[PDB]
Design a protein around this ligand. Sequence first.
Ligand SMILES: OC[C@H]1O[C@@](CO)(O[C@H]2O[C@H](CO)[C@@H](O)[C@H](O)[C@H]2O)[C@@H](O)[C@@H]1O
Ligand SMILES: OC[C@H]1O[C@@](CO)(O[C@H]2O[C@H](CO)[C@@H](O)[C@H](O)[C@H]2O)[C@@H](O)[C@@H]1O
Ligand SMILES: OC[C@H]1O[C@@](CO)(O[C@H]2O[C@H](CO)[C@@H](O)[C@H](O)[C@H]2O)[C@@H](O)[C@@H]1O
Ligand SMILES: [Zn+2]
Lengths: 57, 320
Amino acid sequence: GSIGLTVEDLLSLRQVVSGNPEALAPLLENISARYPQLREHIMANPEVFVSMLLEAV
Amino acid sequence: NNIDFDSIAKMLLIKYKDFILSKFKKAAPVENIRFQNLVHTNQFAQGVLGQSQHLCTVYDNPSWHSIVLETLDLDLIYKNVDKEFAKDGHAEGENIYTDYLVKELLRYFKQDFFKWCNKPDCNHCGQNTSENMTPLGSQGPNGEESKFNCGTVEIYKCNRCGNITRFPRYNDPIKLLETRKGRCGEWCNLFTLILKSFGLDVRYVWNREDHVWCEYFSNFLNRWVHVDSCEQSFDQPYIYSINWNKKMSYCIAFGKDGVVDVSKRYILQNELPRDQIKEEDLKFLCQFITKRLRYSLNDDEIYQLACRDEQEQIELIRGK
Ligand SMILES: OC[C@H]1O[C@@](CO)(O[C@H]2O[C@H](CO)[C@@H](O)[C@H](O)[C@H]2O)[C@@H](O)[C@@H]1O
Ligand SMILES: OC[C@H]1O[C@@](CO)(O[C@H]2O[C@H](CO)[C@@H](O)[C@H](O)[C@H]2O)[C@@H](O)[C@@H]1O
Ligand SMILES: OC[C@H]1O[C@@](CO)(O[C@H]2O[C@H](CO)[C@@H](O)[C@H](O)[C@H]2O)[C@@H](O)[C@@H]1O
Ligand SMILES: [Zn+2]
């Protein structure tokens, strides 16, 4: 369902977004390298990737 | 595939900076009601609200800022900071200077400026005369001492001369500039301002179990730093919970830019029952006060801070 993102990653994520925007992509990448089901929703909806993220703040 | 992250990143950052700028936009009238009423439901909430209302401004009286700047010995202070800066000067040619400043203000206040008051020395008697004084009790302020901010005077009987010495507990930091004595309470209070007067970023952190100290934000290390003037301690948030083995329940910090629960920074062992408030009613509380505390600021100031906010939130919850 929902996002399905690791407590650790999700933390990690919202760390860089707030403190290292210059590296959001390669995180945002590998964080896909790692979640098959998400590789999906990026390829389909980039937008709806974004949503569930800030969402969790 | 070969999905484009760079673009998806950029696009996010923006949609984030937006959402952020909406959080701290607008007075929501739906919240205002919940806040209002929760303040009346729980008092520990009131506690912090009152504290926010005082601490969160109060120390921004350039009036005061001056007086302190006059009365402190800046000549000696900076003399020393430069002495120590020139010594090493830590890592990069950097903001490390302002640390050495605080660090120094620290020693200056201790081995120099302020004196510690356990039992007051007997005035009529000799100078160095704590020992032989028996606590008679405490009472309301005389009147010459309501002229400063004081609810309580502790009264002491001098067993050698048979004369009362009074030790009034003042909240007016300027008065604290005249008496140079105090326990922890006033010890912090003044020093909090002494820092604000050099215009650093400072919170006054309040532990529920009878202790207070201050956090100062270092741009060099760029995080808050636990400073306590009593112990002449620079960066050791543990101190209390481990060396002292304090039993802590709550730690809140109030600074002109936010009230934020910093418990996780300190209560890292010997943890108490946390409950005069639903654990996320508290969260709400702070966030609300800070929002309200920030209606003034423009649209970077506002984001740029909301960032340092998360940055810290994630240092706490990570507990590194
Ligand atoms: O330890 C807190 C306790 O001390 C009092 C004296 O009654 O005043 C001290 O604490 C204040 C904050 O609560 C400081 O700002 C002040 O400088 C210091 O004298 C009371 O306020 C409080 O009960
Ligand atoms: O320890 C609790 C209590 O002690 C105080 C004042 O009595 O600090 C004194 O005792 C400490 C031992 O815990 C010393 O390390 C300290 O330097 C001395 O002033 C307060 O800091 C605290 O409320
Ligand atoms: O006492 C002044 C100052 O010294 C430090 C180290 O800079 O360490 C002292 O205080 C500790 C408790 O707070 C003691 O355990 C230690 O033995 C003592 O040297 C700082 O902590 C303190 O502010
Ligand atoms: Zn005497």
